[PDB]
């Protein structure tokens, strides 16, 4: 059952890597096997102290177990942090590695799943809560006060794995976080509203 | 080949515009539509992904061209030059009338 | 209610030194409101997390937002890449 489950990920992650060549990047052994939140600080310590991802499958480095995919996730996150720190923040091979990390992390999170407030004091008294919760990463925009116009910026394409200090082309800039809006879509109008007789 | 100035900014759309169906004479880029820079009156349902590239050999009549033809007929009620450019300008008057009949 | 307002602005000072990541005109475009971040475009219309059937206080920490977004399974994608060549 786990036989084809590596073969398909192999084929997909090969064919979705043509324009950026992430898989054929150089990568030595790098035995960490650590907490994935430590995955850059551990490689920082590996830089301070002192076989690529395609060749890992050809040598059979991954078993049909939980660790046999945890190592694959670990290797992808390492190569993506390396390729983020290697390029500047505006090049196309920065954004391709960011998109490839997003796609592959989404592909590897699923299919291993197959395999204090007065308003709350009113509502938890009045209703019954069946629920659902999840995590998303937010992003940033800039902020400027001109003469009575009070502008905004676009979304910075800085990835979630950048870790750099926040540089600013102006000190009269400000920075803000954009909370994503998410809920049951508000009932859209019918097609009689969209395209009536004018 | 025409050029499609993106509304709400000054940019040029590359090969995909987002046509609005209630002002009916505006467009957008992809990035101004991903982030929602099109004003709080519109609701991101009334924006159809239209293309800009030259299509295949003629008398195919893709659904984009049929839709823009019917948009033009609802706009102008006459004036088949102003219909044939709104289709895209790569079709003649004498073929738009032969296709609407 | 007008339509033809400008709603984008450009400052005169060329600060184009550390700005290759933002949206440039080709300067820097400065809009009159923020952006809108949308998690997933396609709603998953069934799924009793969302449909709420009328039969039978509980919490559930689902993995990611990707449950609510119609993702294809990988065996079809490998089948289609095999059909590619």
């Amino acid at each position: 059952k786990l036989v084809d489950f590596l073969v398909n990920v192999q084929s997909i992650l090969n064919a979705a890597s043509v324009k950026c060549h992430v898989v054929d990047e150089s990568f030595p052994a790098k035995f960490f096997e650590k907490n994935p939140d430590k995955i850059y600080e551990s490689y920082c310590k590996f830089i301070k102290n002192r076989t690529t991802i395609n060749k890992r499958f050809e040598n059979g480095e991954y078993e049909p177990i939980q660790g046999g995919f945890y190592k694959l996730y670990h290797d992808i996150k390492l190569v993506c942090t390396i390729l983020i720190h290697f390029y500047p923040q505006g090049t196309r091979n920065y954004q391709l590695v960011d998109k490839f990390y997003k796609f592959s992390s989404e592909l590897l999170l699923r299919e291993c799943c197959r395999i204090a407030t007065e308003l709350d004091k009113i509502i938890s008294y009045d209703f019954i809560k069946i629920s659902m919760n999840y995590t998303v990463p937010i992003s940033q925009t800039y902020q400027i006060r001109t003469k009575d116009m009070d502008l905004f910026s676009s979304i910075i394409s800085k990835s979630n794995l950048d870790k750099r200090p926040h540089e600013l082309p102006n000190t009269n800039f400000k920075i803000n976080n954009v909370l994503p809006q998410t809920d049951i879509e508000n009932e859209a109008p019918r097609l009689g509203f969209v395209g009536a007789n004018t | 080949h025409k050029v499609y100035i993106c509304h709400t900014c000054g940019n040029e759309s590359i090969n995909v515009r987002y046509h609005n169906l209630r002002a009916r004479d505006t467009n957008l880029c992809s990035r101004c539509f991903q982030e929602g820079h099109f004003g709080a009156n519109f609701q991101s349902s009334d924006f159809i992904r239209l293309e800009n590239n030259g299509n295949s050999v003629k008398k195919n009549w893709s659904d984009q061209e049929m839709l823009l033809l019917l948009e033009g007929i609802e706009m102008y009620e006459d004036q088949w030059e102003k219909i044939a450019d709104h289709v895209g300008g790569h079709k003649r008057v004498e073929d738009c009338i032969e296709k609407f009949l | 209610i007008m339509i033809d307002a400008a709603s984008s602005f450009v400052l005169p000072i060329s600060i184009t030194k550390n700005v290759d990541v933002l949206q440039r005109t080709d300067e820097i475009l400065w809009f009159r409101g923020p952006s809108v971040i949308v998690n997933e475009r396609i709603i998953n219309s069934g799924d009793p997390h969302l449909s709420l059937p009328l039969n039978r206080n509980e919490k559930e920490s689902l993995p990611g937002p990707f449950v609510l977004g119609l993702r294809p399974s990988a065996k079809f994608t490998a089948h289609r890449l095999s059909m590619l060549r």
Binding site: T146 | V3, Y4, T26, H86 | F9, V10, P12, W30
Partner: peptide, 29 residues
């Protein structure tokens, strides 16, 4: 910096819709 009135980019609706991209039709010398 707070006295730095910004420049509006006007769209001019007829430019946004259908602008094409005259001696190159040889009938006019």
């Amino acid at each position: 910096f707070e006295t730095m009135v910004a420049n509006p980019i006007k769209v001019s609706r007829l430019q946004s819709n259908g602008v094409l991209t005259i001696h190159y039709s040889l009938a006019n010398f």
